[PDB]
């Protein structure tokens, strides 16, 4: 699994691959690993599928629960805190193999400067969290290849289009060097999923757009 998130002027993008493995066997070709968890927040997870789904559903239910009880959404710091608590509560199960790490992307509507309101938070199994202040981040088995690709590609990010482009290319390098990360399937027509967030909110990137970027990347690598 590889999940990528990166900031661009006025928003943040997050994309993820579609592969599920069980040892070396391919147990999944169309897994959706990036969830819109509220109108301005999206969580993408890596690890045991059961813990990932429980994390996504329980987290979204928790956030909307708070804003329905109190008539106002949580601050972004509060969202980070609750997610960290949820990750920490799973530590015992994680030591026994049921390990899953999430990655947080969001748009803080209460931020002073809306151009840099984009937010990326990474987490570890201990609940420790870090707000990333260098632009991009990635979690999963191919996360090192992805971060190292984005280290060279990040200077190209100037808006949402270039941000999504760089994201899908980082996933491409992730699948290029990590057999547990799935690349574009031009035969079945399966591509990574993406969510983009700006001041208008969080939306799922349509399949055909990510397919366009993937084709451009492939033909670029073939020449």
């Amino acid at each position: 699994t590889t999940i990528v998130a990166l900031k661009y002027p006025g928003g943040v993008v997050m994309a993820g691959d579609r592969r599920s493995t069980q040892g070396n066997m391919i147990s999944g070709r169309d897994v959706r690993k990036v969830y819109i968890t509220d109108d301005y927040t999206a969580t993408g997870i890596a690890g045991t599928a059961a813990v990932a789904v429980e994390f996504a559903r329980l987290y979204a239910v928790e956030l909307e629960h708070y804003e329905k009880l109190e008539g106002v959404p949580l601050t972004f710091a509060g969202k980070i805190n609750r997610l960290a608590i949820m990750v920490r509560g799973n530590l015992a199960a994680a030591m026994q193999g049921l390990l899953a790490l999430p990655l947080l992307a969001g748009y803080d509507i209460h931020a002073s400067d809306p151009q840099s309101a984009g937010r990326i938070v990474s987490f570890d199994a201990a609940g420790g969290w870090n707000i990333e202040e260098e632009g991009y981040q990635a979690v999963g088995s191919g996360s090192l290849f992805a971060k190292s690709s984005m280290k060279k590609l990040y200077s190209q990010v100037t808006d949402g289009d270039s941000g999504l482009r760089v994201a899908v290319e980082a996933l491409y390098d992730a699948a290029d060097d990590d057999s547990a990360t799935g690349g574009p399937d031009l035969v079945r027509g399966i591509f990574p999923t993406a969510v983009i967030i700006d001041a208008d909110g969080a939306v799922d990137v349509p399949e055909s757009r990510i397919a366009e970027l993937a084709r451009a990347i492939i033909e670029s690598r073939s020449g």
Binding site: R57, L58, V61, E64, H65, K68, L69, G71
Partner: protein
């Protein structure tokens, strides 16, 4: 025992009597909640679930307790199963049960009157549902409008005279507020207004405040 239950029923009834009126209407766009509320931050109407809304009349702390309990029930049921297995009828049912237990067992009966409303999920054809829950757990399904709080018979009789199915949002608002005052000068500073909008894709609850509410009231 029997006398105790009698004076409990009287305490609750009289408490709701001195309360401001709330009405909920079925209309073309879904359901509309309008409530006499001069407050700024203390709400009588709230979102329950994706397509389920909530209205209350009476003592604030009590129907706010019930409101939170309803949100808890809906969210927990949705996490245990699916969001679509949560129905307005369920919330009305557990509200009848909870208000029954409260009415017979708590130190003081709840001086509250509840309404739970449900509209159709996005793209589906279903006429809205409206349920009324009484301070004693009495539940009733009513097809068009629900009146709660204060002297109700004038307001309800007004809606009996001036209700039209699939009326525009403007029409339903004017009819609701007209019936309200008819039961007893109001305006944006005295109304809390919201809708369950069957056109929204996910969350149907939507508040109409400020400039938009002013534009809707007077035309």
């Amino acid at each position: 025992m029997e006398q105790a239950m009698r004076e409990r029923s009287e305490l609750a009834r009289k408490g709701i009597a001195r309360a401001k009126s709330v009405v909920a209407l079925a209309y073309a766009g879904g359901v509309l909640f309008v409530a006499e509320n001069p407050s700024r931050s203390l709400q009588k109407i709230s979102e329950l679930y994706d397509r389920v809304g909530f209205a209350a009349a009476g003592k604030f702390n009590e129907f706010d307790n019930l409101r939170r309990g309803g949100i808890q029930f809906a969210d927990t049921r949705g996490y245990a199963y699916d969001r679509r297995d949560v129905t307005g009828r369920q919330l009305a049912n557990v509200y009848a049960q909870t208000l029954g237990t409260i009415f017979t067992e708590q130190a003081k009966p709840y001086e509250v009157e509840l309404c739970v409303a449900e509209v159709a999920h996005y793209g589906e054809t279903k006429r809205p549902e409206l349920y009324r829950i009484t301070y004693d757990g009495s539940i009733a399904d009513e097809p068009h409008f629900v009146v709660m709080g204060g002297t109700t018979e004038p307001i309800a009789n007004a809606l009996k005279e001036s209700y039209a199915e699939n009326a525009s949002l403007t029409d339903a608002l004017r009819i609701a507020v007209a019936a309200l005052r008819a039961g007893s000068t109001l305006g944006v500073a005295s109304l809390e207004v919201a809708v369950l909008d069957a056109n929204r894709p996910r969350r149907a609850f939507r508040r109409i405040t400020g400039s938009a509410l002013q534009a809707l009231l007077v035309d």
